[PDB]
Design a binder for this molecule. Structure first.
Ligand SMILES: COc1cc(/C=N/NC(N)=S)cc(OC)c1O
Ligand SMILES: [Cl-]
Ligand SMILES: [Zn+2]
Length: 315
């Protein structure tokens, strides 16, 4: 007795492709790797309840390859399976609204993702891949499962792996439209003279070495080939935010002098991030947890500042 059902395959969950599946055969035999809202059904035979449902499949023909690239801006063959494997976990996480922002309840070492997500909602940033546009829209609304699985997929992190907030933001920024952002720096060494530099896109909004925007504007000290220490300062900046980063160090955060920041406690193998946002007062969001204070000291790794246009007074 031959029994079949109609299902739809997809790579982007928007464009659907009609299929008829033989119920005596697994999905894998008919589609290759197959997933149902993140669950791997490759080795599963079709069920009655599957009629009319949508299954993700790996791009196995030209139409799916193009739809997948256009949606995700990647051709990495393992991407889709990594997105699905993550989604199967992020689906089960909780996304409380904490002080008006979508957070994530702690699970599976995801503190780095909560503080990244809380940060995004505080800076002006538009994603390029439609997958991130759509999923970020839902995350802002409270349904962040797909966005978090996508972050994992894009950063090649699996659920449970310890992450780095700076590295994660780097990947997110890579997939954002920062074409307008420009940075000008000058470096003065008393043996080599001076050198000016211009940076664009991601490199225009990220700096590694100091947490303080003001200190960047006045000068910091870096090594030279000559052997002397030079001074680097910020000549001009064009961007809606800047991110300053440093190895974690005790650092004092003053209300109203920054947008938000990330705090890291522990060591390189394992530790814990928390998020500090400056609103009417200082709020610390630790996943689902919230505390407040008027002043804050702690081991800060990243600080985010607002910006529009800045020209250095320094002659
Ligand atoms: C074969 O696996 C994948 C292929 C593509 C895109 N291919 N597009 C081209 N090669 S022109 C995208 C993926 O995830 C979004 C995959 O997992
Ligand atoms: Cl967006
Ligand atoms: Zn020199």
């Amino acid at each position: 007795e031959v029994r079949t059902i109609k299902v739809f395959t997809t790579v982007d969950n928007i464009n659907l492709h009609t299929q008829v599946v033989d119920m005596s055969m697994t999905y894998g035999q008919q589609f290759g790797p197959t997933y149902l809202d993140g669950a791997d059904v490759t080795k599963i035979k079709p069920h009655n309840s599957h009629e009319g449902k949508t299954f993700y499949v790996l791009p196995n023909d030209d139409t799916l390859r193009v739809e997948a690239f256009e949606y995700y801006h990647t051709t990495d063959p393992s991407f889709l399976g990594r997105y699905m494997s993550a989604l199967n976990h992020t689906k089960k996480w909780k996304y409380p609204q904490v002080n008006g922002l979508t957070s994530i309840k702690w699970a599976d070492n995801n503190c780095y993702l909560a503080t990244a997500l809380l940060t995004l909602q505080q800076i002006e940033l538009k994603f390029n891949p439609p997958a991130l546009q759509d999923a970020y829209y839902r995350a802002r609304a409270g349904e962040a499962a797909n966005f978090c699985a996508l972050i994992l997929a894009y950063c090649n992190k699996t659920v449970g792996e310890l992450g780095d907030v700076r590295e994660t933001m780097s990947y997110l920024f890579q997939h954002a439209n920062l074409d307008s952002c420009k940075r000008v720096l000058n470096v003065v060494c008393k043996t080599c003279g001076q050198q000016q530099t211009t940076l664009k896109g991601v490199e225009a909004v990220m700096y590694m070495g100091t947490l303080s925007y003001e200190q960047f504007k006045k000068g910091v000290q870096i090594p030279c080939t000559c052997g002397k220490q030079a001074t680097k300062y910020l000549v001009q900046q064009e961007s809606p935010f800047v991110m300053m980063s440093a190895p974690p160090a005790q650092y004092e955060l003053k209300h109203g002098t920054f947008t938000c920041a990330s705090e890291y406690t522990g060591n390189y193998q394992c530790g814990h991030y928390k998020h500090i946002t400056s609103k009417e007062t200082l709020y610390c969001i630790d996943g689902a947890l919230l505390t407040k204070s008027s002043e804050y000291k702690g081991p800060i790794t990243d600080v985010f500042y607002k910006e529009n246009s800045y020209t250095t007074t320094i002659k």
